[PDB]
Ligand binder design. Structure first.
Ligand SMILES: *CCC(=O)c1cccs1
Length: 147
């Protein structure tokens, strides 16, 4: 019954069922709804000391740990989900990628162009949906499918 990658799960704190996508790392209380040759996505990348290139326009030498990058990703996701902050706003200010200057937009792409975990999460998102933390050799991403 569930669309690609989704599974039912049990919430530790409340006991209420929720849904988790192991391809995108998304999670939500609501039952999910539901492939194209191309999708369009934006992202916010947080790099760490084990990133393929630990440098960015924000910081010449990125020194934070993988665990610290994941905490930062978690906090941005919280603020996007509560509406305190827009995704485009946080990507512009804090993404460790040159795509930050374009509010995180990467344009359209097909399968066979992106790093595999990014590509998989991108094509498993529905239009308008956001990923959880997505791990690649560049760092940790939040992905927003826009088309
Ligand atoms: C900053 C460059 C980067 O990590 C990516 C480019 C396209 C998808 S990830």
């Amino acid at each position: 019954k569930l669309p690609p990658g989704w599974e039912k799960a049990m919430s530790r704190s409340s006991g209420r069922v929720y849904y988790f996508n192991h391809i995108t790392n998304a999670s939500q209380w609501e039952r999910p709804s539901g492939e194209p040759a191309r999708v369009r996505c934006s992202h916010l990348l947080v790099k760490h000391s084990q990133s393929r290139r630990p440098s960015s326009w924000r910081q010449e030498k990125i020194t934070r740990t993988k665990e610290e990058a994941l905490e930062l990703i978690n906090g941005y996701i919280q603020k996007i989900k509560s509406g305190e902050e827009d995704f485009e706003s946080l990507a512009s200010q804090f993404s460790d990628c040159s795509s930050a200057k374009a509010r995180g937009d990467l344009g359209a792409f097909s399968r066979g162009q992106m790093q595999k975990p990014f590509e998989d999460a991108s094509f498993a998102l529905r239009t308008g949906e956001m990923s959880g933390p997505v791990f690649t050799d560049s760092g940790i991403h939040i992905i927003l499918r826009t088309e």
